[PDB]
Amino acid sequence: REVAPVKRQKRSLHKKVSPNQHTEFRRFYDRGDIPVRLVHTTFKNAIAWSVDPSVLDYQHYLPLFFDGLREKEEPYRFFARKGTWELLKNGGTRVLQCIPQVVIPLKKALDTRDMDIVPVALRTMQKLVKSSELAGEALIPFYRQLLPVLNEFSLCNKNLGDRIEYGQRKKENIGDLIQETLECLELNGGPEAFINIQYMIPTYQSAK
Amino acid sequence: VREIVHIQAGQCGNQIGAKFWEVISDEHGIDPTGSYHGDSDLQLERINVYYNEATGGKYVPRAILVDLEPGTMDSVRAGQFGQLFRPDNFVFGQSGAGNNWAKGYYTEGQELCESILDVIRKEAESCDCLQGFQLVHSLGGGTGAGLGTLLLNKLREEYPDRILSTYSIVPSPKVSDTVVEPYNCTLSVHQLVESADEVFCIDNEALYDICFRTLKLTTPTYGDLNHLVSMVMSGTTCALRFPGQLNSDLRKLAVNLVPFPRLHFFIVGFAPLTSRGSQQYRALTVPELTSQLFDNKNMMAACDPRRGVYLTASAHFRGRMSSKEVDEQMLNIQARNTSYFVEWIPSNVKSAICDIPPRGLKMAATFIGNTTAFRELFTRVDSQFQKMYARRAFIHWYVNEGLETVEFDEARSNMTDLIQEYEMYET
Amino acid sequence: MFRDKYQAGFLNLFYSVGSKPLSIWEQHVENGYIKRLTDPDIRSCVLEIVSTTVNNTYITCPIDPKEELAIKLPFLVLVLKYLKKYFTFEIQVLDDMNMRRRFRASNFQSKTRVKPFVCTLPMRLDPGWNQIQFNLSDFTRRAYGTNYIETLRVSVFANCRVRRIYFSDRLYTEDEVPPEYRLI
Amino acid sequence: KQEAADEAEYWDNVRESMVPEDTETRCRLLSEEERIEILNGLYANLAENKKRYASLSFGQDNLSFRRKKEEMEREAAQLEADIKTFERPNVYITEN
Amino acid sequence: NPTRKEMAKGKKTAEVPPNVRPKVMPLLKNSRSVKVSRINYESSDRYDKAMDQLDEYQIDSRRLGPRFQRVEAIQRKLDEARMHYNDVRLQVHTQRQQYEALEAAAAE
Ligand SMILES: Nc1nc2c(ncn2[C@@H]2O[C@H](COP(=O)(O)OP(=O)(O)O)[C@@H](O)[C@H]2O)c(=O)[nH]1
């Protein structure tokens, strides 16, 4: 017997979307205003600074690199990654003032739900928190705007079973990457980290 | 059962490996898509030795391809059996070497080493029992030689018990292809002597000689030469995959043929070989195979054993044949030519039998012997290298990569000791 | 099975290194994943079992639900990596009164009640790899007061990385063991 | 009863006309007679080609002669590759 | 009879051509009666399943037939009307160009 004839359920399209050509970091590099240059030493593509980091103005220059993470094409992508990582790790205490200004571009980058943008933002999440030994406790009020995307990809993982995993080098598995940043935030955030994280993502379990 | 992991460095090695997997796939009856469609149940007795299974009726070979430029990788994917290779196993760089041995060894070797070890660890741990790996590379080049030497040292460090079987192609003394060829072989040999358990030598000159001595083809291509090398490849490992009346493996071959640790460089040869039209005239029997194997024209290494002496010899057979006939043939060849065999080691010849012959061949055989004729090969490269080395100019390329100039003398001194070691064992 | 087999020294029941480690076990997955991967702490391949519902994701041995083990060794040794999450496992043994019992332990367990059917044990582990050793004969002799008979069934649940499950005839300390049968 | 059969057969035939099935299992298996016909044709072609190859000259070298030897060599290689392909007792093909 | 043992075995009831089904069914009923006369209950059950599947297939075949016929007739009507619409559109276009060519002559 039959009692209804209804619709079809949405076929889990959460990974396919991929836009292009968004950022504002382009226009500053489209005219040679960004003081970065590419060095083509054959070992690895390395970047060079037109302005030494000692005299760099962090409040205006750091947010621009965070904007470039949303880029899809090669040079802006590579310059954004290398510039962001270098500045965050070597800047030190000067980063803490730039957190309210760099969260918004990071929020925009995370909201794209792109296949490759989210891994870079997740790694940037890791490196931003470990700047000096502080500023992981300053992201607590920003959890309500940064973490909501991590719910989307939290439970996605590769189910194989007996098969040995082959992709561990170019580790792309979203579940393991999300878990790493959540442990890093939980260890670095402090006593109030777990309360806010558990409020945001109820699936997570403590590291205390 | 007892697995072997296959490694393909080198533009030469990749083509050799690609043809080798074509031969094995035809031998076992594996579709280019990896699905079994054969006719013999014996083909699935020990297919796990070379293949891993992907649920869904798909078998993936234990193949790892290494390079420094993606051009070779693109060519391999364009091949007929390119879908069989696992895409992730392809590991390659972006900055080539350009036949510069030092550049491949130091500059890109350090980067490529860390990554490639993870796949070699994965497949080594994806078997119930590992016997040894397998390396195919060229010596005159700069990518396969330098990187293979680095990976051979790393393989020895990580896996001491496992047998590191290496197959190499010696630069052609008369006409090979590069200005700088003596330098690459000079630095590669020192690493090969200490680490590799077994080294097999093949020369392109002998292959072209074999083509016009026996095959009578007009315009031979690299496909035929790679096919003969793959034929020797299959014959060496055949006894592991199929039963027989007298079984031998890489360990048994090493024990019998190697009397001393450094005397392990071997020559290879195959029989039967017959031109496309003369095969009707020939009556293929056990004595005919014995004549072809020991014949100098069929030897695929450019070193005449008659100029030297034999230390150990080994013969393997594929098909169904009388063991008495094989033993009699081995004894007769030993008594007839006593002027070539070392006096203090009797019964220098080994024998083995494999039940299943290859496709199309009713009877087949493979010969691996060790002789003092190898001293000519190192003498040739040393002679060419000597006047290369006295004119420092060409090494200045390798000096840029951080290589010390004293590295060349250490390698040359090692070859001189090896040549002397082969000399006094003749007496 | 193992009724016939000679049992002396060591008898391993699971090992992440090899072709098909789970070819001997049964796999049940709900709301989670089972994956085999390479762990950086030991630089060797290990099995991974993680799920949102620990009760609905486990591996059991032997495969066949009617058949039972015949492992004569009194000691079962577990080597697992703790993932700061809920963990549980159960072992089924036979008693001298011709009775069946199962010992399910849990880290989120609270009490240690010994009601006749199942026995519950709370335990606490340290972060990283552990070397839990459970003496089946001693536990049955001490807790239930009966006598121990050969092990029957083994089950391990999710939120852990397991690479070694073996039995020993007696308790061995460090280095009186094969070099593979210990932690790096 | 004939009238009932006519009604039943017509509607059955109309229904079957609309629903086809995929050819992944329906790929045609060649008959033994066709396989023998192809095999003997290839066998005769190979025998003729090798007979031509045997009928050549020593020492003769020129563009035409060496091109003839090249063509006959590759023709024989293709024919034997085809012969081995059709050597199997079961051949599944999708004819064009 | 070689076929009638196959639907007793599990034939799809579609591999049989439609002309054969009317001649199959009397044999299936008779063989089921023999198999239930002899004390053998499963042998009669498979025959019962085979005949019921044959009947269920043919009943819905009648129910499905006219639906396909109605769809086909409407489809050919739609194609016919579309072709007429395209011809009318061209006729309209030609008429408008004809009028404009006359108005321009009048204007000059
Ligand atoms: N036998 C054979 N050798 C080849 C083939 N293709 C390339 N080679 C060899 O590859 C060598 C050059 O190697 P190179 O370009 O430096 O790359 P490498 O092999 O990784 O060092 C030459 O000595 C060639 O003999 C082939 O198809 N067959």
Helix (H, G, I), strand (E, B) or coil at B92: strand
User: Which residue's CA is the nearest one to ligand 1's atom 13?
Assistant: B141
Q: Positive or negative, the Cα torsion across A98, A101, A103, A108?
A: negative
Cα distance between residue E62 and residue E58, in whole Å:
6
Backbone torsions φ then ψ of C151, nearest 5 degrees? -60, 145
Cα distance between residue B317 and residue B228, in whole Å:
16
- C-alpha of E107 from chain center: 63
Structure tokens that stand for B9 in this block: 């460095």
- C-alpha of B76 from chain center: 20
Q: Computed over its alpha carbons, how large is the radius of gyration of chain C?
A: 16
User: How far from each other are the two terminal CA atoms of chain A, in whole angstroms?
Assistant: 54
Quick check: CB of B233 below 6 Å from ligand 1?
Answer: no
Helix (H, G, I), strand (E, B) or coil at B90: strand
Task: List all residues 6 or more positions away from D28 whose beta carbon is below 8 Å from its beta carbon.
Answer: D92, D93, D94, D95
- Residue count of chain B: 427
Structure tokens that stand for A137 in this block: 């406790």
- C-alpha of A86 from chain center: 15
Q: How many CB atoms lie within 10 A of CB C172?
A: 16
Which residue is listed with tokens 């009724």?
Answer: C3
Cα distance between residue A188 and residue A183, in whole Å:
8
Q: Tell me how far the alpha carbon of residue B79 lies from the centroid of ligand 1, in angstroms.
A: 18
Letter string b/e over residues E36-66, b meaning 16 or more CB atoms within 10 A of that residue's CB = eeeeeeebbeebeebbeebeebbeebeeebe
Technique used to solve these coordinates: cryo-EM
Cα distance between residue B221 and residue B290, in whole Å:
28
Write out the DSSP string of B293-359. Answer: HH-TTTB-SS--GGGS-EEEEEEEEES---HHHHHHHHHHHHHHTGGGB-TTS---EE--EESPPPT
Cα distance between residue E36 and residue B373, in whole Å:
88
Residue A186: exposure state from Cβ atoms within 10 A (0-12, 13-18, ≥19) = buried
Helix (H, G, I), strand (E, B) or coil at B279: helix
Quick check: CB of B144 below 6 Å from ligand 1?
Answer: yes
Q: How many CB atoms lie within 10 A of CB B233?
A: 25
Q: Which chains touch C (3 or more CB pairs under 8 A)?
A: A, B
C:105-144 residues touching chain A, CB 8 A cutoff: none
* Contact call for B95 and A167, based on CB within 8 A: no
Letter string b/e over residues B148-159, b meaning 16 or more CB atoms within 10 A of that residue's CB = bbbbbbbbbeeb
Task: List all residues 6 or more positions away from B62 whose beta carbon is below 8 Å from its beta carbon.
Answer: B3, B4, B5, B6, B50, B51, B52, B123
Q: Which of B156, B10, B167 is nearest to B97 (CA)?
A: B10
Which residue is listed with tokens 């009877």?
Answer: B363
Strands C99-106 and C88-95: antiparallel
CA distances from A189 to A140, A200, B270, E87 (A): 7, 14, 69, 75
- Axis crossing angle, helix B375-389 with helix B406-424, rounded to the nearest 10: 150
Q: Which of C179, C183, C166 is nearest to C75 (CA)?
A: C166
Q: Which of A27, A101, A35, A31 is nearest to A62 (CA)?
A: A101
Q: Positive or negative, the Cα torsion across B86, B88, B94, B99?
A: negative
Give residue C175's identity as a one-letter amino acid code. Answer: D
Q: Which of A67, A158, A153 is nearest to A104 (CA)?
A: A67
Cα distance between residue D5 and residue B88, in whole Å:
62
- C-alpha of B64 from chain center: 16
Letter string b/e over residues C105-126, b meaning 16 or more CB atoms within 10 A of that residue's CB = bbbeeeeeeeeeeebbbeeeee
Cα distance between residue C38 and residue C46, in whole Å:
6
Quick check: CB of B68 below 6 Å from ligand 1?
Answer: no
Backbone torsions φ then ψ of C4, nearest 5 degrees? -80, -35
Cα distance between residue B103 and residue B115, in whole Å:
18
Using the Cβ of C42 and the Cβ atoms of chain A, whether some distance falls under 8 Å is answered with no
**Pairs of CB atoms within 8 A across B/C:** 20
Q: Which chains touch E (3 or more CB pairs under 8 A)?
A: D
Quick check: CB of B107 below 6 Å from ligand 1?
Answer: no
Q: Tell me how far the alpha carbon of residue B72 lies from the centroid of ligand 1, in angstroms.
A: 11
Would you say C91 and C13 are in contact if contact means Cβ atoms under 8 Å apart?
no
- Which of B138, B143, B225, B233 for mutating ligand 1's site (highest number of atoms within 8 Å of CB)? B138
For residue B126, the chain A residues in CB contact (below 8 A) are 164
Bridge partners, C60 (sequence order): C26, C155
Q: Positive or negative, the Cα torsion across B266, B271, B276, B282?
A: positive
D:54-83 residues touching chain E, CB 8 A cutoff: none
Would you say A67 and A105 are in contact if contact means Cβ atoms under 8 Å apart?
yes
Give residue B126's identity as a one-letter amino acid code. Answer: S
User: Which residue's CA is the nearest one to ligand 1's atom 12?
Assistant: B141
Which residue is listed with tokens 């026996």?
Answer: B214
Using the Cβ of C53 and the Cβ atoms of chain B, whether some distance falls under 8 Å is answered with no
Cα distance between residue D20 and residue D26, in whole Å:
11
Cα distance between residue A46 and residue A78, in whole Å:
10
Helices (H), chain A: 25-29, 58-68, 74-91, 99-110, 117-129, 143-146, 150-153, 174-189, 193-200
Which atom from ligand 1 is nearest to the alpha carbon of B147? 20
Quick check: CB of B302 below 6 Å from ligand 1?
Answer: no
Would you say B300 and B269 are in contact if contact means Cβ atoms under 8 Å apart?
yes
Write out the DSSP string of chain E. Answer: -TTHHHHTTT--SSSS-TTTHHHHHHHHHHHHHHHHHTT-HHHHHHHHHHHHHHHHHHHHHHHHHHHHHHHHHHHHHHHHHHHHHHHHHHHHHHHHHHHHHHHHHHH-
Would you say D94 and D27 are in contact if contact means Cβ atoms under 8 Å apart?
yes
For residue B107, the chain A residues in CB contact (below 8 A) are 42-43
B:34-53 residues touching chain C, CB 8 A cutoff: 48, 52
Q: Is the peptide bond before B87 cis (omega within 30 degrees of 0)?
A: no
Would you say E54 and E17 are in contact if contact means Cβ atoms under 8 Å apart?
no
Which atom from ligand 1 is nearest to the alpha carbon of B139? 21
Q: How many CB atoms lie within 10 A of CB A101?
A: 14
Q: For residue B55, give how far its alpha carbon lies from the nearest alpha carbon of chain A (Å).
A: 9
CA distances from B233 to B22, B227, C169 (A): 12, 9, 46
* Contact call for B218 and D54, based on CB within 8 A: no
Quick check: CB of B11 below 6 Å from ligand 1?
Answer: yes
* H or E stretch at B287: helix B286-294
Backbone torsions φ then ψ of C122, nearest 5 degrees? -90, 140
Bridge partners, C162 (sequence order): C47, C80
Cα distance between residue B5 and residue B133, in whole Å:
5
Structure tokens that stand for B388 in this block: 């290369």
Using the Cβ of B392 and the Cβ atoms of chain C, whether some distance falls under 8 Å is answered with no
Q: Which of B190, B151, B348 is nearest to B259 (CA)?
A: B348
Tell me which of B23, B27, B276 to substitute to probe the interface with D (most D C-beta atoms closer than 10 Å).
B276
Helix (H, G, I), strand (E, B) or coil at B366: strand
Cα distance between residue C38 and residue B122, in whole Å:
8
Cα distance between residue B23 and residue B21, in whole Å:
5
Degrees, nearest 5: CA angle B104-B109-B114: 165
Kindly state the DSSP code that residue B172 receives in the 8-state scheme. Answer: P
Q: How many CB atoms lie within 10 A of CB B391?
A: 8
* H or E stretch at B231: helix B222-241
Q: Is B404 left (phi over 0), alpha (psi -120 to 50) or beta?
A: beta
Residue D38: exposure state from Cβ atoms within 10 A (0-12, 13-18, ≥19) = middle
Residue B241: exposure state from Cβ atoms within 10 A (0-12, 13-18, ≥19) = buried
Kindly state the DSSP code that residue B383 receives in the 8-state scheme. Answer: H
Give residue B361's identity as a one-letter amino acid code. Answer: L
Residue C3: exposure state from Cβ atoms within 10 A (0-12, 13-18, ≥19) = exposed
Helix (H, G, I), strand (E, B) or coil at A34: coil
Quick check: CB of B319 below 6 Å from ligand 1?
Answer: no
Cα distance between residue D47 and residue D75, in whole Å:
12
Write out the DSSP string of chain C. Answer: --SSS---SEEEEEESSSS-GGGGSEEEESSEEEEEEEETTTTEEEEEEEES-GGGEEEEESSSSS----B--SEEEEEEEE-SS--EEEEEEEETTTEEEEEEEESS-------SSEEEEE----SEEE--EEEHHHHIIIII-S-EEEEEEEEEESSEEEEEEEEESS---TTSS-TTSS--
Write out the DSSP string of B388-406. Answer: HHTSGGGGHHHHHTT--TH
* Contact call for B122 and A44, based on CB within 8 A: no
Cα distance between residue E38 and residue C115, in whole Å:
56
CA distances from B339 to B68, B294, B333, B373 (A): 48, 14, 11, 14
Structure tokens that stand for D62 in this block: 């020129």
Which atom from ligand 1 is nearest to the alpha carbon of B137? 19
Which atom from ligand 1 is nearest to the alpha carbon of B10? 20
Q: Tell me how far the alpha carbon of residue B138 lies from the centroid of ligand 1, in angstroms.
A: 6
Q: Is the peptide bond before B272 cis (omega within 30 degrees of 0)?
A: yes
Q: After which residues is the backbone of chain D broken at C–N > 2.5 Å? A: none
Q: Tell me how far the alpha carbon of residue B171 lies from the centroid of ligand 1, in angstroms.
A: 10
Q: Which of E20, E28, E71 is nearest to E50 (CA)?
A: E28
Structure tokens that stand for B279 in this block: 């095969």
Structure tokens that stand for B377 in this block: 């090969």
Resolution in A: 4.2
* Contact call for D18 and E68, based on CB within 8 A: yes
Q: Tell me how far the alpha carbon of residue B16 lies from the centroid of ligand 1, in angstroms.
A: 10
Helix (H, G, I), strand (E, B) or coil at B63: strand
Helix (H, G, I), strand (E, B) or coil at B65: strand
Degrees, nearest 5: CA angle B77-B78-B82: 45
Degrees, nearest 5: CA angle B357-B360-B363: 40
Cα distance between residue C35 and residue A166, in whole Å:
11
